[PDB]
A = this chain, B = another copy of it.
Amino acid sequence: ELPQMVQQLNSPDQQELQSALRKLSQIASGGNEQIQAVIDAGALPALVQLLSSPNEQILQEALWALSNIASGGNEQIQAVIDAGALPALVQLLSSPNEQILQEALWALSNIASGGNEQIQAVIDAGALPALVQLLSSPNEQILQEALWALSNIASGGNEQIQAVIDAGALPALVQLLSSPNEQILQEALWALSNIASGGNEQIQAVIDAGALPALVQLLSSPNEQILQEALWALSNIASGGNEQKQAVKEAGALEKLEQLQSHENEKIQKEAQEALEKLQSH
């Protein structure tokens, strides 16, 4: 019975509540179909309500369930947003409890893994200032969690990318390119690459932030993994705002890049004339 659990989300019996929660986390896993069934049973209102709980045991598992639900499709992500989860998630980003912070960042990043509609909701909720603050954290675990969420946000449209820039993320990112920690370097380059996958305005901001000297320095690295990550980002920078020459750090991006080469031709037909005509009008 699924409604029994949903009912039991309002139970004052913490033992009966915790069982319905962890079981819901189990149901939320296993595909968007089970996710949708949870959504249809009307659980989200009570779920989000528990995000204000001072009971870390309940809060944790609650965030766990919301994250699973948010791992579904954009439609299923949007239901989470509609339920009103973002404002509570954003405030939890200031928590001194690293356990809660991870769960909050996990849920928030899954929401930011959807469409620009979902990404923009994250931005409109005020999540970027907190995320940027965390980039200065000496906790490598917190740092990864924050970059993961920022990366997903920077994977959207140019306006989303620009929001990230205006939030002051680039200075922290550039400083991390000097880290001797290859794991931090990967995470930082991942985020940068998504940011460099925007328009000329966005790319120029990366340059103005002093990213190139560090990227250039890494081209000499004997670490093939660093090399790929550095080249990826620099390649996006050298794209000139042309999204057919950019690739967001996601599966299928390089394959798509190759396919677009054999179809930019008719798109390159009109650039060459724009070049000749503009020159002939010197």
List the interface of chain A (C-beta within 8 A of B).
13-18, 22, 24-25, 27-35, 37-38, 41-43, 46-47, 50, 54-62, 64-65, 67-69, 71-74, 96-102, 106, 109, 113, 115, 138-144, 148, 155, 180-186, 200, 203-204, 207, 212-213, 215-216, 219-220, 223-228, 231-232, 234-235, 237-242, 245, 252, 255, 257-259, 261-268, 270-272, 274-275, 277-278
Contacts and interface: CB of A to CB of B under 8 A. Distances in A.
Per DSSP, are chain A's interface residues mostly helix, strand or loop, or mixed? helix
A109 to B, nearest CB: 7
A140 B68 CA distance: 22
B240 A15 contact: no
A223 B225 CA distance: 8
A162 B112 CA distance: 33
Given A30-B241, A58-B182, A227-B61, A266 B216 contact: no
A265 B13 contact: yes
B100 A57 contact: no
B106 A261 contact: yes
B27 A203 contact: no
Contact of A46 (B113, B141, B220): B220
Nearest to A220: B46
A65 B235 contact: yes
15 contacts: A14-B223, A24-B274, A25-B263, A31-B200, A31-B241, A32-B115, A38-B237, A41-B215, A43-B238, A61-B231, A67-B245, A68-B240, A72-B240, A73-B275, A102-B258
Contacts of A38: 212, 234, 237-238
